[PDB]
Amino acid sequence: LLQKYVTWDDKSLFINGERIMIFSGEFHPFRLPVKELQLDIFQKVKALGFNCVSFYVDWALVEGKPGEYRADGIFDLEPFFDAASEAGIYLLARPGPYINAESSGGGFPGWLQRVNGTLRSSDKAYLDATDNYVSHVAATIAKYQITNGGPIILYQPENEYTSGCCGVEFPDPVYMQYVEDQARNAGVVIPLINNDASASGNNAPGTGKGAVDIYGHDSYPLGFDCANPTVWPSGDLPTNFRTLHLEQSPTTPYAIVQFQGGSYDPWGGPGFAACSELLNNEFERVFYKNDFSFQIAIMNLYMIFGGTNWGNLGYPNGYTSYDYGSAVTESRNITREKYSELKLLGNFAKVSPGYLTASPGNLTTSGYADTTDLTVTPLLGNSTGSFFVVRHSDYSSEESTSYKLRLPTSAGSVTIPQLGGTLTLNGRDSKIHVTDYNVSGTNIIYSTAEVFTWKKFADGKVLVLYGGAGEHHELAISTKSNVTVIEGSESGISSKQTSSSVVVGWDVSTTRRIIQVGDLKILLLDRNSAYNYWVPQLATDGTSPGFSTPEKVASSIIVKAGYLVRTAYLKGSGLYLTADFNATTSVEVIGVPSTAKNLFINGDKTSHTVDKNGIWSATVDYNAPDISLPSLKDLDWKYVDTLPEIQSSYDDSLWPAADLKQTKNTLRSLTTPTSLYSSDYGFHTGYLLYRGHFTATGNESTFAIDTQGGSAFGSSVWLNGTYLGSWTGLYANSDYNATYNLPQLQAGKTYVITVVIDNMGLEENWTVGEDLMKTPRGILNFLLAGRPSSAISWKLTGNLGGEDYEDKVRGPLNEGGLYAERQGFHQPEPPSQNWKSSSPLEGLSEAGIGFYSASFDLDLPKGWDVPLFLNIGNSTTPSPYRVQVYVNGYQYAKYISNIGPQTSFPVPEGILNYRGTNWLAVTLWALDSAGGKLESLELSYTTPVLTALGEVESVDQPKYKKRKGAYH
Numbered sequence: 001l002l003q004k005y006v007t008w009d010d011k012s013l014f015i016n017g018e019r020i021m022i023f024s025g026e027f028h029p030f031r032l033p034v035k036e037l038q039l040d041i042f043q044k045v046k047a048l049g050f051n052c053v054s055f056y057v058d059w060a061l062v063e064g065k066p067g068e069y070r071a072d073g074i075f076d077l078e079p080f081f082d083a084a085s086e087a088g089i090y091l092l093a094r095p096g097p098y099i100n101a102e103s104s105g106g107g108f109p110g111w112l113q114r115v116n117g118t119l120r121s122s123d124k125a126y127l128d129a130t131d132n133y134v135s136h137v138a139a140t141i142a143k144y145q146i147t148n149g150g151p152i153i154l155y156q157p158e159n160e161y162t163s164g165c166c167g168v169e170f171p172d173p174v175y176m177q178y179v180e181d182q183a184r185n186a187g188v189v190i191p192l193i194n195n196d197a198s199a200s201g202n203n204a205p206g207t208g209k210g211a212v213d214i215y216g217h218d219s220y221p222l223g224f225d226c227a228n229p230t231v232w233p234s235g236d237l238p239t240n241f242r243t244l245h246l247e248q249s250p251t252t253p254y255a256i257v258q259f260q261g262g263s264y265d266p267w268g269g270p271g272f273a274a275c276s277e278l279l280n281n282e283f284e285r286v287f288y289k290n291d292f293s294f295q296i297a298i299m300n301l302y303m304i305f306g307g308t309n310w311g312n313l314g315y316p317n318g319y320t321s322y323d324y325g326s327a328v329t330e331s332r333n334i335t336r337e338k339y340s341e342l343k344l345l346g347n348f349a350k351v352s353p354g355y356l357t358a359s360p361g362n363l364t365t366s367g368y369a370d371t372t373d374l375t376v377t378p379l380l381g382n383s384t385g386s387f388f389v390v391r392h393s394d395y396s397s398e399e400s401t402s403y404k405l406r407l408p409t410s411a412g413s414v415t416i417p418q419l420g421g422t423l424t425l426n427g428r429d430s431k432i433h434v435t436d437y438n439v440s441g442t443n444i445i446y447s448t449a450e451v452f453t454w455k456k457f458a459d460g461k462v463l464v465l466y467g468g469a470g471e472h473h474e475l476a477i478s479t480k481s482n483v484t485v486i487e488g489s490e491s492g493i494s495s496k497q498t499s500s501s502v503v504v505g506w507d508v509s510t511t512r513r514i515i516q517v518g519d520l521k522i523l524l525l526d527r528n529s530a531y532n533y534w535v536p537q538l539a540t541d542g543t544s545p546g547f548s549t550p551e552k553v554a555s556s557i558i559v560k561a562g563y564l565v566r567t568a569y570l571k572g573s574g575l576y577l578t579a580d581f582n583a584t585t586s587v588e589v590i591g592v593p594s595t596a597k598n599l600f601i602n603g604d605k606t607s608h609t610v611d612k613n614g615i616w617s618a619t620v621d622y623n624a625p626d627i628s629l630p631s632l633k634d635l636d637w638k639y640v641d642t643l644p645e646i647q648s649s650y651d652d653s654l655w656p657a658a659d660l661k662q663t664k665n666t667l668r669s670l671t672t673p674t675s676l677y678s679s680d681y682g683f684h685t686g687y688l689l690y691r692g693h694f695t696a697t698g699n700e701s702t703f704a705i706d707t708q709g710g711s712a713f714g715s716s717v718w719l720n721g722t723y724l725g726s727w728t729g730l731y732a733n734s735d736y737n738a739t740y741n742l743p744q745l746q747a748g749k750t751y752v753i754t755v756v757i758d759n760m761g762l763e764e765n766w767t768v769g770e771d772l773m774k775t776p777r778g779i780l781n782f783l784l785a786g787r788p789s790s791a792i793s794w795k796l797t798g799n800l801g802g803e804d805y806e807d808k809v810r811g812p813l814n815e816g817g818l819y820a821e822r823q824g825f826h827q828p829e830p831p832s833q834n835w836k837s838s839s840p841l842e843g844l845s846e847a848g849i850g851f852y853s854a855s856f857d858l859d860l861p862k863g864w865d866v867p868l869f870l871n872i873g874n875s876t877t878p879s880p881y882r883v884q885v886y887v888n889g890y891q892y893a894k895y896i897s898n899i900g901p902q903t904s905f906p907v908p909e910g911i912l913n914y915r916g917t918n919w920l921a922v923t924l925w926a927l928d929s930a931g932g933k934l935e936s937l938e939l940s941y942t943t944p945v946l947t948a949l950g951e952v953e954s955v956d957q958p959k960y961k962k963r964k965g966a967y968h
């Protein structure tokens with residue numbers, strides 16, 4: 001419509017007039033705020049065979065103060081976009097304004113709790129509130145569209161606009177049309193795509209006002225039961241997605257904008273390791289090939305890399321880690337087998353244009369395979385090839401199943417295997433068998449083994465096939481030439497030549513075989529060996545791979561290596577590879593250009609040999625250096641009391657008064673004389689402190705109080721210095737009604753009730769009209785028994801300044817309301833020389849909150865990517881306590897001893913300074929009259945990786961500076 005660079009038809013997108021299958025991964029820049037590591041992820045995604053990344057922008061992080069848009073430094077989208085371009089990865093931009101995303105407010109800033117109108121509706125107050133954010137974020141996106149030479153090809157307005165309640169005329173076409181117009185008015189001309197939470201047809205082309213350009217929906221078919229990772233429940237495998245697609249949006253390519261790539265894990269859950277097991281390689285091969293059986297043309301995996309909910313950006317139900325059990329782990333490693341398996345499918349899609357021009361049929365339990373225990377879904381082409389997706393009919397089956405195929409080809413129907421034996425499907429696996437597969441003019445009549453990749457080089461053609469262990473396979477090629485085995489044993493390889501073809505049968509082996517048929521070389525691999533192959537694009541003009549255009553795909557090389565191959569480029573007589581290694585690694589290059597004489601790996605000339613088939617070989621030795629990490633318990637820990645409020649000398653006269661007679665919160669009307677909702681006073685994040693002043697009569701007995709912080713929150717209450725008690729918290733409770741006995745009080749004396757409340761984050765707003773994001777935080781109800789409720793005059797604080805937030809570098813969410821946070825002591829070089837010496841391992845002897853500070857040095861070597869972890873012990877059932885850890889001012893750990901499950905906290909290079917000084921600030925809150933302490937506190941690492949990554953620059957780490965506006 002509005003530009004010629006990205007168009008579509010009923011089958012696929014076109015980019016500059018060429019069909020492409022968009023295979024994408026979800027990656028959120030605000031969860032990895034280090035620009036060099038963003039590039040690392042993009043390159044790891046490109047190495048899967050993927051061509052796109054989908055991202056959210058978090059409004060809450062970039063407009064913490066209403067009217068002040070700030071997407072600078074660590075929140076700057078421009079280096080993220082340049083890193084996508086450099087990696088050769090297109091982008092799907094999803095700026096919301098509502099994003100959900102397991103984030104605080106679902107993206108909405110806390111100040112939306114004061115908006116007089118329904119969130120995500122036509123109400124003018126809501127739409128006005130979004131205008132400054134969208135005109136800024138969409139203008140930045142506009143500048144980096146493909147129409148302006150950037151990477152961004154598609155735009156998503158809103159997020160899962162799918163269910164309404166409570167008087168909203170859902171779906172509101174005026175609402176969606178306004179949201180789409182905002183983006184258009186900011187210069188966005190690329191196609192708009194939506195993400196219906198289920199396949200319900202909302203906003204599809206043809207629905208009139210508020211229709212998007214391309215209809216997308218989401219799917220998490222296997223669910224989120226991470227505690228039972230081997231259980232695949234009955235009927236969870238979708239079978240009707242093409243049927244629903246033809247009914248709801250037949251004119252647009254079939255698109256799943258969020259397909260399950262992992263799972264969330266709540267406070268108290270089984271842990272993200274368990275989620276990786278549920279959504280593992282078996283899940284991918286069965287569920288993702290099933291999506292291929294519907295001829296999906298835009299597929300985005302949520303998440304490909306999850307990262308971290310640092311600095312309180314997460315929603316209340318989640319904890320610090322957002323690992324998500326995804327293909328790329330929270331610590332950026334690609335060890336999980338699901339990565340290597342996904343790489344096989346991504347590379348298959350990258351070289352198979354006939355996939356998008358075929359004609360999909362219904363699944364069948366007969367006609368293609370000779371057992372009803374198997375299901376085959378055909379994608380049939382006239383001359384462009386056909387595809388046959390095979391799985392067990394009972395998709396959860398772990399049975400080993402023998403079968404024969406009867407397939408249609410351009411040379412007629414064929415019963416496979418022709419030369420004898422049977423095919424095998426071992427349990428939770430699925431195959432894409434191919435017929436009339438075009439390898440640059442050479443016709444593969446059929447292959448039962450799956451295609452990984454193929455290329456045409458100057459000196460011939462190469463095709464790479466694989467199968468699982470124990471399987472027999474067969475292929476046929478249209479040709480007059482015979483077959484010869486050119487590498488590996490001739491055993492288990494049977495052949496037959498006809499007048500117009502050669503048939504070849506083979507058993508899968510751990511040892512590679514290479515056969516040759518005319519100018520085609522065919523590598524015959526087992527799955528586990530195929531995991532070690534890579535297909536980098538080969539740059540001749542520079543060093544960057546470029547986007548996956550048909551030309552740059554065709555000129556790729558095949559590299560057998562280990563952990564990672566990032567790039568390849570040719571320059572003069574040098575073949576340059578960039579790669580990473582986690583072990584001593586044999587490197588083989590196939591398709592070396594004729595002009596190349598020398599092999600360089602990561603800048604360094606590397607000796608190579610050339611075997612009889614023209615394959616260059618080399619070795620990269622892995623010899624890890626001594627990684628020396630300091631013992632955190634032995635540091636020079638300085639302590640300060642971070643709850644001075646409970647001492648009688650404390651003067652709170654500069655605190656904001658909690659004296660508002662009316663709330664601006666439309667969701668929940670006041671049940672106290674004044675509002676004690678934190679967001680009414682601009683406080684949306686971290687720990688909240690309330691102080692209630694009263695004069696005693698002498699007859700007081702009890703104080704009852706309803707506190708609300710969200711799932712797994714806690715609160716503690718003191719009367720002057722006297723500890724009344726705590727709600728220690730449960731995932732099940734987002735609020736709690738406590739009743740405390742007071743000590744005997746003195747007539748006419750003044751007292752202060754101090755209340756500490758853990759704000760776990762603001763709720764999401766999934767159902768339009770329910771306004772759940774407005775769920776307040778703080779005190780809902782109180783009663784000083786026998787006294788009118790107006791007896792207590794309340795003051796409060798959250799982060800210092802509230803919406804006039806102090807740390808513009810680290811963003812509006814990072815810090816909360818504790819004394820030591822308000823003073824800025826969590827930053828590098830706090831004024832701690834004369835503070836008491838005490839360690840968090842010594843801890844507290846009564847209920848309270850202590851603040852601990854120490855520095856340490858790292859001297860880790862260059863050229864090594866070393867994932868570092870911060871560990872808090874939990875070997876025995878603990879007393880109830882809560883811990884935050886700030887690393888160079890960035891909150892990178894939130895720990896609740898009694899709820900869990902996280903004890904291991906990754907912290908990226910860039911936040912940590914690998915050749916320099918680092919600062920740890922630790923708050924320790926004992927919700928127990930006997931106090932508490934850490935069992936252990938350790939810094940650890942996992943496998944160092946010899947890496948091609950450039951220098952990781954430290955992010956801005958503003959040091960401590962005295963604050964004018966503090967209560968002091």
Ligand SMILES: *[C@@H]1O[C@H](CO)[C@@H](O[C@@H]2O[C@H](CO)[C@@H](O[C@@H]3O[C@H](CO[C@H]4O[C@H](CO[C@H]5O[C@H](CO)[C@@H](O)[C@H](O)[C@@H]5O[C@H]5O[C@H](CO)[C@@H](O)[C@H](O)[C@@H]5O)[C@@H](O)[C@H](O[C@H]5O[C@H](CO)[C@@H](O)[C@H](O)[C@@H]5O)[C@@H]4O)[C@@H](O)[C@H](O[C@H]4O[C@H](CO)[C@@H](O)[C@H](O)[C@@H]4O[C@H]4O[C@H](CO)[C@@H](O)[C@H](O)[C@@H]4O[C@H]4O[C@H](CO)[C@@H](O)[C@H](O)[C@@H]4O)[C@@H]3O)[C@H](O)[C@H]2NC(C)=O)[C@H](O)[C@H]1NC(C)=O
Pocket residue numbers: 276277278280281282334335336337340426468469528531532562563564582583943
């Ligand atoms: C450097 O980077 C590298 C990446 O570039 C990285 O390599 C990767 O490492 C990861 C692990 O970190 C690998 O992923 C695991 O792979 C395991 C091995 O299975 C795979 O490989 C075999 C063939 O290879 C083997 O055999 C040779 C010897 O012949 C050895 O050289 C190999 O080391 C390997 O041997 C191991 O496994 C044997 C048993 O299989 C053992 O006898 C032996 O002692 C070794 O432990 C294939 O046959 C496998 O295919 C079969 O199984 C898969 C998966 O189940 C099926 O899908 C397939 O159809 C075949 O049947 C397979 O490819 C896996 O065992 C391991 O599996 C599990 O963990 C994941 C979670 O991570 C789960 O999804 C999965 O369900 C499995 O869960 C079990 O294990 C975990 C504990 O780890 C439990 O939580 C869970 O409860 C469950 O345990 C229970 O069930 C099991 C039943 O059999 C059994 O363990 C117990 O009975 C138990 O009760 C996982 O997938 C990855 O493949 C590597 N990738 C590459 C490219 O190499 C390397 O680590 C990095 N290095 C460093 C130093 O950092």
Ligand SMILES: *[C@@H]1O[C@H](CO)[C@@H](O[C@@H]2O[C@H](CO)[C@@H](O[C@@H]3O[C@H](CO[C@H]4O[C@H](CO)[C@@H](O)[C@H](O[C@H]5O[C@H](CO)[C@@H](O)[C@H](O)[C@@H]5O)[C@@H]4O)[C@@H](O)[C@H](O[C@H]4O[C@H](CO)[C@@H](O)[C@H](O)[C@@H]4O[C@H]4O[C@H](CO)[C@@H](O)[C@H](O)[C@@H]4O[C@H]4O[C@H](CO)[C@@H](O)[C@H](O)[C@@H]4O)[C@@H]3O)[C@H](O)[C@H]2NC(C)=O)[C@H](O)[C@H]1NC(C)=O
Pocket residue numbers: 271272273274277323329330331332333335867869871872873874875903904906936938940942943
């Ligand atoms: C790629 O990225 C991944 C994400 O970043 C990353 O995975 C994370 O890795 C860290 C570090 O390894 C994990 O933290 C550790 O978890 C250990 C417990 O989990 C284990 O328990 C089960 C074993 O049956 C399994 O569930 C689990 O395996 C599963 O998960 C694997 C992924 O990790 C997966 O591959 C498997 O297939 C499977 O699904 C796993 O085995 C935990 O033990 C460990 O804590 C110890 O180590 C810390 C660091 O040194 C110490 O500070 C800490 O105190 C613990 O050490 C002490 O306790 C141990 C108890 O046995 C002893 O072994 C130690 O020697 C030590 O002993 C002292 O203390 C004892 C009391 O505790 C006492 O008894 C002793 O006398 C002594 O005083 C740590 O928490 C994290 O969970 C992973 N995160 C996720 C999301 O998976 C992965 O590693 C990356 N890979 C690479 C190569 O980079």
Ligand SMILES: *[C@@H]1O[C@H](CO)[C@@H](O[C@@H]2O[C@H](CO)[C@@H](O[C@@H]3O[C@H](CO)[C@@H](O)[C@H](O[C@H]4O[C@H](CO)[C@@H](O)[C@H](O)[C@@H]4O[C@H]4O[C@H](CO)[C@@H](O)[C@H](O)[C@@H]4O[C@H]4O[C@H](CO)[C@@H](O)[C@H](O)[C@@H]4O)[C@@H]3O)[C@H](O)[C@H]2NC(C)=O)[C@H](O)[C@H]1NC(C)=O
Pocket residue numbers: 266267268269270731732733874876877878896897898899900901902903
């Ligand atoms: C340090 O080590 C200590 C000692 O081991 C660790 O302490 C243990 O920590 C466990 C995790 O917090 C804790 O188990 C939990 O205990 C409560 C008991 O009431 C229970 O609610 C928990 O189970 C639910 O919640 C978790 C998530 O927090 C879910 O993963 C789980 O499936 C359960 O979910 C159900 O309840 C939720 C409400 O909270 C619902 O949202 C959810 O949908 C689901 O609801 C269905 O089932 C309910 C009935 O079960 C029903 O009411 C509802 O209608 C639905 O049908 C979990 O068992 C241990 O008790 C605790 N042990 C000790 C000795 O203290 C500590 O965590 C470790 N610390 C660290 C840092 O790792």
Ligand SMILES: OC[C@H]1O[C@@H](O[C@@H]2[C@H](O)[C@@H](O)[C@H](O[C@H]3[C@H](O)[C@@H](O)[C@@H](O)O[C@@H]3CO)O[C@@H]2CO)[C@H](O)[C@@H](O)[C@H]1O
Pocket residue numbers: 100101102160197218219220224258263264766767
């Ligand atoms: O990363 C998590 C992922 O969750 C996805 O939603 C999940 C299911 O797809 C969705 O059908 C289900 O819908 C729930 C809703 O989440 C709850 O608010 C509940 O009260 O009402 C609905 C019941 O049908 O929610 C699942 C998550 O638990 C999101 O679509 C996706 O964007 C992610 O957030």
Ligand SMILES: *[C@@H]1O[C@H](CO)[C@@H](O)[C@H](O)[C@H]1NC(C)=O
Pocket residue numbers: 243362
């Ligand atoms: C193929 O599509 C539908 C799936 O809804 C199936 O029920 C039917 O047998 C086939 N369609 C027709 C028109 O026969």
Ligand SMILES: *[C@@H]1O[C@H](CO)[C@@H](O)[C@H](O)[C@H]1NC(C)=O
Pocket residue numbers: 383384438439440441
């Ligand atoms: C096979 O691919 C070549 C490009 O290498 C193309 O010109 C030819 O038309 C293709 N043939 C078919 C039948 O798709």
Ligand SMILES: *[C@@H]1O[C@H](CO)[C@@H](O)[C@H](O)[C@H]1NC(C)=O
Pocket residue numbers: 482483495497
């Ligand atoms: C093809 O190769 C086979 C097995 O190596 C051989 O026996 C046969 O004679 C060859 N075909 C022709 C036509 O020569």
Ligand SMILES: *[C@@H]1O[C@H](CO)[C@@H](O)[C@H](O)[C@H]1NC(C)=O
Pocket residue numbers: 647648649650720746749750751752
């Ligand atoms: C309680 O604290 C206040 C000031 O915070 C102080 O003035 C008052 O005297 C204290 N009450 C008692 C009984 O000591």
Ligand SMILES: *[C@@H]1O[C@H](CO)[C@@H](O)[C@H](O)[C@H]1NC(C)=O
Pocket residue numbers: 116663664665666
């Ligand atoms: C919102 O203000 C409108 C007037 O603009 C008024 O009708 C309504 O009572 C107000 N409600 C709340 C909860 O603020």
Ligand SMILES: *[C@@H]1O[C@H](CO)[C@@H](O)[C@H](O)[C@H]1NC(C)=O
Pocket residue numbers: 706733735736737781
């Ligand atoms: C606390 O009491 C209030 C007011 O009666 C009630 O509505 C709320 O549900 C209670 N909270 C819990 C967690 O039961």
